[PDB]
Fold this protein.
Amino acid sequence: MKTPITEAIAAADTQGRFLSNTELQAVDGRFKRAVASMEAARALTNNAQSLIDGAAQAVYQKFPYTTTMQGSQYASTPEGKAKCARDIGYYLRMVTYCLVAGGTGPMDEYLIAGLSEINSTFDLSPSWYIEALKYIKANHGLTGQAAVEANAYIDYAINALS
Amino acid sequence: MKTPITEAIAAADTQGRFLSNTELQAVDGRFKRAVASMEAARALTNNAQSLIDGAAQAVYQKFPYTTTMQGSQYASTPEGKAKCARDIGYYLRMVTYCLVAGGTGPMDEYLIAGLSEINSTFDLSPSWYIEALKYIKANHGLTGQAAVEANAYIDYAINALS
Amino acid sequence: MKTPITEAIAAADTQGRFLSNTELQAVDGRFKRAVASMEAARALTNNAQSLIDGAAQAVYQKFPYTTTMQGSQYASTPEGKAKCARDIGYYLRMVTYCLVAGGTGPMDEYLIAGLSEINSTFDLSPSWYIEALKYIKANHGLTGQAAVEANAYIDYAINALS
Amino acid sequence: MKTPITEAIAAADTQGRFLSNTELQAVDGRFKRAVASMEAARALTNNAQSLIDGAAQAVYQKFPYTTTMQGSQYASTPEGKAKCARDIGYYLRMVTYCLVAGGTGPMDEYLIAGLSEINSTFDLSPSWYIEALKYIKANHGLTGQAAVEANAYIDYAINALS
Amino acid sequence: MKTPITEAIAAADTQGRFLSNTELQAVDGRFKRAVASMEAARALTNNAQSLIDGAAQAVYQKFPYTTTMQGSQYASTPEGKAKCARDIGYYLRMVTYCLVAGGTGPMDEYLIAGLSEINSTFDLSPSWYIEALKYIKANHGLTGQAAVEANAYIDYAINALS
Amino acid sequence: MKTPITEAIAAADTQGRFLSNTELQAVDGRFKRAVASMEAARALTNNAQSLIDGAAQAVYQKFPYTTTMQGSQYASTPEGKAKCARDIGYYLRMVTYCLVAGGTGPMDEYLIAGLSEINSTFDLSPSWYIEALKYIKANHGLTGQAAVEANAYIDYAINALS
Amino acid sequence: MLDAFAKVVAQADARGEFLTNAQFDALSNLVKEGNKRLDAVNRITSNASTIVANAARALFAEQPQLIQPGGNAYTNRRMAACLRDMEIILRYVTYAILAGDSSVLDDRCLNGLRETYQALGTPGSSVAVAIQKMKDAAIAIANDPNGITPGDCSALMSEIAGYFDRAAAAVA
Amino acid sequence: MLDAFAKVVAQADARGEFLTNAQFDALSNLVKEGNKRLDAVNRITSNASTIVANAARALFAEQPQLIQPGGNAYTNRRMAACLRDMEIILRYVTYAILAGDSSVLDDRCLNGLRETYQALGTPGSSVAVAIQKMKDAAIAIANDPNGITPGDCSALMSEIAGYFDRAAAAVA
Amino acid sequence: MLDAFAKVVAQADARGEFLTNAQFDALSNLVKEGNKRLDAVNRITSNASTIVANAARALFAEQPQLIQPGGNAYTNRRMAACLRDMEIILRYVTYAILAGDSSVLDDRCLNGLRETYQALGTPGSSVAVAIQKMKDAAIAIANDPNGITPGDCSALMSEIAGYFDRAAAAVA
Amino acid sequence: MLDAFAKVVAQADARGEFLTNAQFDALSNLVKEGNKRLDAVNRITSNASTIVANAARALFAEQPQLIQPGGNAYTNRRMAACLRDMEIILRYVTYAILAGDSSVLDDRCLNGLRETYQALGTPGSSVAVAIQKMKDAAIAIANDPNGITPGDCSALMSEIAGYFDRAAAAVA
Amino acid sequence: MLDAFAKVVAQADARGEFLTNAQFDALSNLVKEGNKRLDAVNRITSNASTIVANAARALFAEQPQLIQPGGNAYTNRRMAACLRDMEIILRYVTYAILAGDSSVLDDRCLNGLRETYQALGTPGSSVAVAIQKMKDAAIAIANDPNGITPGDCSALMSEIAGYFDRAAAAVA
Amino acid sequence: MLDAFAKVVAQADARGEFLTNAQFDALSNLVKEGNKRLDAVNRITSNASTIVANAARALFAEQPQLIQPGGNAYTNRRMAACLRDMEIILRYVTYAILAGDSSVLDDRCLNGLRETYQALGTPGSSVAVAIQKMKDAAIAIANDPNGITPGDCSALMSEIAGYFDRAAAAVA
Ligand SMILES: *[C@@H](C)[C@H]1/C(=C/c2[nH]c(/C=C3N=C(/C=C4\NC(=O)C(CC)=C4C)C(C)=C\3CCC(=O)O)c(CCC(=O)O)c2C)NC(=O)[C@@H]1C
């Protein structure tokens, strides 16, 4: 899994090298950044339910056809609405993992790999998830560097869906 | 050249990726560490002459046969003594480059690649340079994290000669 | 470009071989099938305008949000409606090329390669094109083997969008 | 084994692709050609004995030294004559396999691979087999497309021996 | 070109190595063997015409059909007889090159590479050349180690034709 | 293991070839050279003890700091003197193996591979071994081609240490 | 790989024999039934995406543990690879239908597959279920009376079903 | 590579156009003339060895300097490679005949060929001669009235001759 | 590749010199201005998809010939590759911003690029236009006063603009 | 590979859960103890050559059979490879210290290692001894009170010792 | 691989010893008997084609089932591969004769060979028979009194026979 | 590559001729002078390290700009590569001495070398100087009267000098 720490090791190991100051510095930056990352992960976790709920409605609001068109891919049935909220939960949870891990690894591994395939196979619009993610970004209530941290991984997901 | 910054880019570029937070954190650690590195580089530069001079004598002291045995590889002639001091200067200067660059790149590139070959071809004992480096480590007059920085690159050179 | 004829040659050339009866038979099947393919290509060409026009409306009908949501990706402006019809024309024209060429080559080359990228970048729903293609399939007025031919390349496109 | 059908699959599988119309057409040509191929295979099978017998003598006629020179490679002994007829039978039987299979696969696999080695090791003249094959071509009594089929695989063997 | 000398160099160069005693010894064996090789090459050169002439007739004797069957591949015409003698000359001349060079290189390069192709394309029986070579072996009038030398390259050719 | 014989085989086997005269000649040179090599190996073996003893002192003489500096790498203790003599014995014994084997193989395999690593890790000066080897060369009491043989492998070792 | 024709030739060569009159007749029937085979292949192939997606959806509906966190089809990577495998199997089954012989399916898809799933932790029984769903769907699409010259394709559907059953056995 | 059909599609796509009624008609003629094309390919291919060997023999007879020692076709390696090149050219010419387009010949055989011969010291003028000999032989075999349903293949022979001339121009 | 720090070390080594007091000071300023650099990189990177898509749309709007049939960005393959190139350039420009030096951009992106477009028929002038559009957008996003500690980043925006101009010069 | 942070995320994802307040706290402690970890890594790494050479010398002193002729560490090639292995192990142990997790050590160093030594004839028990010597030396260097801000690193030394013990178990 | 000389050196090094006077003497005998070894190698090699072809013919005469249809040496591919294997074995046996040691034969020919034949369905007992035939022929050719300086080569023929027996044991 | 013997054979084959009595005689002289050639090769090779190191030291003494910072042989990497090149040249020159022909030197060392140095910024004139120094040293060692059977090797030294001059011309 890609973290500042595993990248540092990977760089050394790729060359058959012991770790050098070159890498220890990278890891130190990770350790220092962790204060902001952890704040963000905690706040997003604590507020996850309202963020997810609010995010789901923001989608339904922007794309109301998703609540009315017939189809297993839509949120026009209770089961469809439940899958949609689950997915949004997934995204949010991955953001928090990225924050804890200090890198994109969890989202890369658990969510982004295969994403286009799954979206295209199950007829899910990336634009739906982007709206959910834009809502979360707008309303997570973080400021300062904790917000910069949350937003970097949220925008990473947005980029992966674009 | 290997620096925390070029490693960060290399990691992203290797994967066809934009930079992620994963890498920006590494670079931030580099920027924060630079305060200690730069202190060290400045002090070693300011005091380079006395360090080199003292280091040369520390070698001659430990290995006095180097000042008396006949041979172009020894410091038994004025020209040999001048080459020895030049080399020690080289090592010290490389340490300072590593400190400025925030990584081993300069020493790797300018000094370590080819080192064993040159030492074996010209009959130079690694143990000579190690003594010089041990002297510099002992007497650079740095404390705190500036000393940790200087010593990490000095010991790196020592390791490369062992 | 992939046609029964170029596949036959590719198979021989891959092995440094002259063409054998093995391949001439494949090409003969192509020549015999061409009667049905050419009927289909002619009818779809002759009727292209009404097919395109009907297909566009079938999309707007199934996805009426595409005619009302603001956005360059939608057909909510005259220019958007014109791009949509152009695209549908593209698909239809590619079907006819596949029929003339006796294979998927033209569609592979001119349309399918890059398709997911373009769809994801410009926020175009594959489901839109599939509806257009389903309309064309339903209403091209072909029967017998001419219809089997048209439908094989239309369903190929549908598969490529799924 | 190389047949129009296995070539069609090989082409699709090489690319990770489902079969397309491109390939089904090739297989259809094979199915249509099979009527002519099967006629030819049946007639050559029914008349195999007289063809083989006639072919053997045509060789002995053109190369009478093969019936008189001493040597295990020649047909100057009963056992040598029996091996010669067996071999000719082999060739004819392979032709019929090629016709049934709709391609060169059987002859490639069972006869042509290793052919030059075996001929050179056992001191067998390709020109002998070519004469046998020329006889069979001249006297198989097929006309129309059944003859075109038989001759394509007979000439294939001739080419492989040249 | 493959000689004991070029093999020795090739072995050293393959490993980025200077020549070692390992190789100088091989070359010395070559230099010592050259006395026997050179005797043989001289005698075969001096007597080339009668050897070639005798060898040609030995072929015609063993395979008299070659002097009577119609065909450009046979020696049934003046021009065919001239090509046959030329070829035999070629073989003999190559033997002498192998002897001078101390190795198979010349024959490998000038004669054996492509040999099976040329023989099969122009319908030339290897057995013809083998008889020519057997004659030369029988009648070159060498004894001792000069004969061992000549025979090693003659049998090499025989092997290449078998 | 690299010997004239194994090189000869390696050259043939690399090409899927039977041995040719090209290689037998190399092996013959080896067999002829063996008379000189074996003389040398016997004399060096018979006189090994005095050669080793004399060689050790020649080192201590040229580098007297090796008998006085404190350190496990030096011969300033009984155990250090014993390791030094052992090593010199090793070199001499390897020379004799090279002579018996007719090539560098034993020394390559048992001594040279890893040599720089071991020398650098244990802080052993190549110049020490070279002096030992120069002594052995000067005092082995061989003349003629037996001396040429011994010296070729001794200088090979010297080269490997330079 | 072999098709049905090469299969017969291979058996005959092992015996050193010319084809019998019965074998020619058999193989002529195969040829006569060729159009139907091409229709089946066309139809299944032309609907490959929905066969797979509908079969996936059915699987996960019946076995929700596969897509619960920790589940073998949980995460998009594992989902994508699962869908992929369903695609791969359907692909080789259609090759087999074209060839009239399973050697391509056996050789290039089915061999090593059980061992592969066993090593990954992928439940083969679940794969078998997905294959059976695709089978039922493939056959309904292939054997649809609408839009095709009427005739009986029952033998063919039996054969087709056989490749799917074979595949499901290989993993279960 | 392109065949005659893809060639037309490629031209049409560059214009963004549907095929005209004239282009359909043209391409339908191509299809109607298909059997003759298959005969030509069959015939030339079925006689590939003699076309080449007879053309080689004719070449060396007319230019004995090529097989004198020092000559470009002297030694068996150089002979084998020469024969090979004649085989290669004939092969790609037959591909071109099948495709009804020279792109395979141009792309995969003819490009870089002059420069290649120029670098080796192989006289291109001699190659051209060998190609022309194969041409004359290929066409006599392809256009032989015996053992084939009577009709006119003149257009086709013109086309065929064109691929051979093209090849000979590319090296000369 | 070099960053701004290694760049100075490389110049100094070529002279055999220790760093001067002026060079330490310079490099300390670089470090002091580090946060701003990280913000720029973050911001541009975090908005990479819209910068590219918005710049593509603007390009094709101003030069519709590029997406007319026959056009260099017509067909999805050519479109995809165009978008890709815009992605690639933006990527290397951001590397350059991080490094404070263009060597990565020059070495790994910009060299051979003009020649490459010239060989393909891709109009470099059009590429330059797309780069400039991305530049304007990248800088507006990077230099947005909202949601960031107030300060002046003008020097940095100048530097950033310089990498984009450099890139556009390299292809135009 | 995983670090201590990714390790927790991986466990949480398998459950489909957000992190608990207890897990955040744990991971915040890890971060708070980060400097000490960096010191350990620095110190062990900065002294890698002497740790290995001193441990080798100690090994061969206690087990002279390893360097007697016939011995597994006799000849320079076998010596070099032995020293190498000691280098490799120490390297991966330090990676593990940095990561706060052994997955890199287990995955990339320790797996297959016993089987490898068993196949070569290398006595694993001897390797274990060398690892333990390096352990004792690594820890004395890492936990040296001189020249470092005073504090307790005992937990860390326990962890470090654990990676070395793990390594020694894997081969013994 | 080892030759007889390196074999002795390798044994001596494992003991850490200089060669004894008895070993020098032995190895000097080997050298003294060198010419005979070169003759054997020359003779067998110079007749390699007939040894193999005559041994193949004898094999198939005694075991006609091998070349009946279905048989392991039936079809030219299987025949060619069989002849090949006989060539390969004879080749490595001659290497072994040159080296005076079987390590090249064991290492590069004989190891894995039984398992290989067992996997293919090739009857090893038949291979052994072919090897023995080549042996008898190789030795008659090598030990032919005609055209060579008279002497006794019996020891050598015993050694040679030993490599062939070894080879036959390895497959039987 | 060619040796002096193959060189003659190659010239003769180009003419289609048997060797003349004059050529046999020449080549017999070469053989007769073989020992001296082996001595030269042995001697130069046995002293390869000092020839190179002494020539390097002499070069840098006469051209100190090469090892001043910025200089082409400054830094250990550039030094190592320089020494290497001197090693490489000496190596191929000794191959050439063994072969009695420069084809190995020309083909595998000298071709492309000037262009290579021109591209790197390596001054060829300096390389030439180093080659000449090695030449003078190689020849003094090869032609040393001490410890060798007295005779005249002047012709050989001329030849040797020729390979070195050739090499120096190729780079200068
Ligand atoms: C021009 C770019 C605009 C701008 C920049 C700006 N930032 C600061 C302060 C900070 N920027 C960061 C950003 C990071 N540190 C990291 O490690 C990473 C990657 C993990 C990032 C993205 C931080 C931590 C700070 C300090 C705390 C804070 O939030 O301010 C300033 C103030 C001066 C400074 O350098 O610290 C400025 C000016 N601000 C503008 O107005 C420009 C539009």
